[PDB]
Design a protein around this ligand. Structure first.
Ligand SMILES: *[C@@H]1O[C@H](CO)[C@@H](O[C@@H]2O[C@H](CO)[C@@H](O)[C@H](O)[C@H]2NC(C)=O)[C@H](O)[C@H]1NC(C)=O
Ligand SMILES: *[P@](=O)(CCCCCC)OCC
Length: 317
């Protein structure tokens, strides 16, 4: 696992600073903050204000989020700089206190990629609560790439990419901070997720990997957005955030919690919105950036995906 000094950011900090926001507080003076990293095609609010912005608020957190432009459709490596910048600012901003990271979809891959290649933040993140993270990418994007209708981070999230290869090769498929991964064998976006083992895309060695059906049964069906918004997710979500061990506890959730509807504590307006989650996402993808190659990896990661091929050609250290 890499250690040492962090790679430099390719982006100006004022730009990285532009990407962060806290609900009713400044990053420099925010208390009990939680960082929220959105999925492909969305801004922090589009992903979380019908769900975890309101939910982390009632559990006593000040929701802060990053919104890398354009809608998380860009080089995952750059989206990560926004996260590193934010954590650095909030640990500082809350008095050099560690902070929890809550992610959705690509956001979990960003959290892990930063924890892997930017050693400084390992001591600032208290725990990682990840909903439907695609650490091995997704087998479902095959069409999209042979289809070359893909935004940079779509190329990077396809199983077999130089980026997911680099993450596995650098040792990032193991938990760096106490991590709880909540996911569904019935995810329509990220696959595979059916074996309740290391083969799943959401799985991290030593993490608390919660495959929905392994708790609720083979008939329990929750989708991609419902992995983030459901009532079952709130119960494990809250367990992780309250846990002394940093991961969700079994004693905390059971069969009674196997409710797939949006969380009970949401207003109806919020529940409707949470049910409609992928709409803003799908639109942005159709509407935003495309390309026929995977963006090039940054120097710091090339030696971990040597031989793979990106925009420029074959990868060499
Ligand atoms: C999207 O990420 C790309 C790919 O890395 C960024 O493009 C680079 O711009 C930086 C800093 O502004 C320069 O150091 C590099 O020379 C560029 N590389 C390539 C391949 O383009 C881009 O800045 C990001 N844009 C947004 C809106 O996030
Ligand atoms: P996630 O970032 C979820 C994005 C949902 C968009 C629906 C079209 O995806 C991992 C590939």
């Amino acid at each position: 696992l890499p250690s040492g000094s962090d790679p430099a950011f390719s982006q100006p900090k004022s730009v990285l600073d532009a990407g962060l926001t806290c609900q009713g507080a400044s990053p420099s003076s925010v208390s009990k903050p939680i960082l929220l990293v959105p999925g492909t095609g969305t801004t922090g609010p589009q992903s979380f204000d019908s769900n975890w912005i309101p939910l982390s608020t009632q559990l006593g957190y000040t929701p802060c989020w990053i919104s890398p432009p354009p809608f998380m459709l860009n080089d995952t490596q750059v989206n990560t700089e926004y996260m590193v910048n934010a954590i650095t600012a909030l640990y500082a901003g809350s008095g050099n206190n560690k902070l929890p990271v809550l992610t959705w979809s690509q956001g979990g891959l960003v959290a892990q990629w930063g924890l892997t290649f930017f050693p400084s933040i390992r001591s600032k993140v208290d725990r990682l609560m990840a909903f439907a993270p695609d650490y091995k990418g997704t087998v479902l994007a095959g069409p999209l790439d042979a289809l070359a209708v893909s935004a940079p981070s779509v190329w990077q999230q396809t199983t077999g990419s130089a980026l997911t290869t680099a993450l596995r090769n650098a040792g990032g498929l193991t938990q760096i901070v106490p991590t709880t991964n909540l996911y569904s064998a019935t995810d329509e976006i990220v696959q595979p997720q059916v074996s309740n083992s290391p083969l799943d895309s959401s799985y991290l060695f030593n993490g608390k990997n919660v495959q929905a059906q392994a708790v609720c049964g083979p008939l329990f069906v929750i989708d991609h957005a419902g992995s983030l918004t459901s009532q079952f997710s709130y119960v494990v979500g809250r367990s992780a955030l309250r846990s002394t061990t940093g991961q969700a506890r079994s004693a905390d959730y059971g069969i009674t919690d196997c409710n797939p509807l949006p969380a009970n504590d949401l207003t109806p307006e919020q529940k409707v919105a949470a049910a409609a989650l992928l709409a803003p996402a799908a639109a942005a993808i159709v509407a935003g950036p495309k390309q026929n190659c995977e963006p090039d990896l940054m120097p710091y990661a090339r030696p971990f995906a040597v031989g793979k091929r990106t925009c420029s050609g074959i990868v060499t250290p």
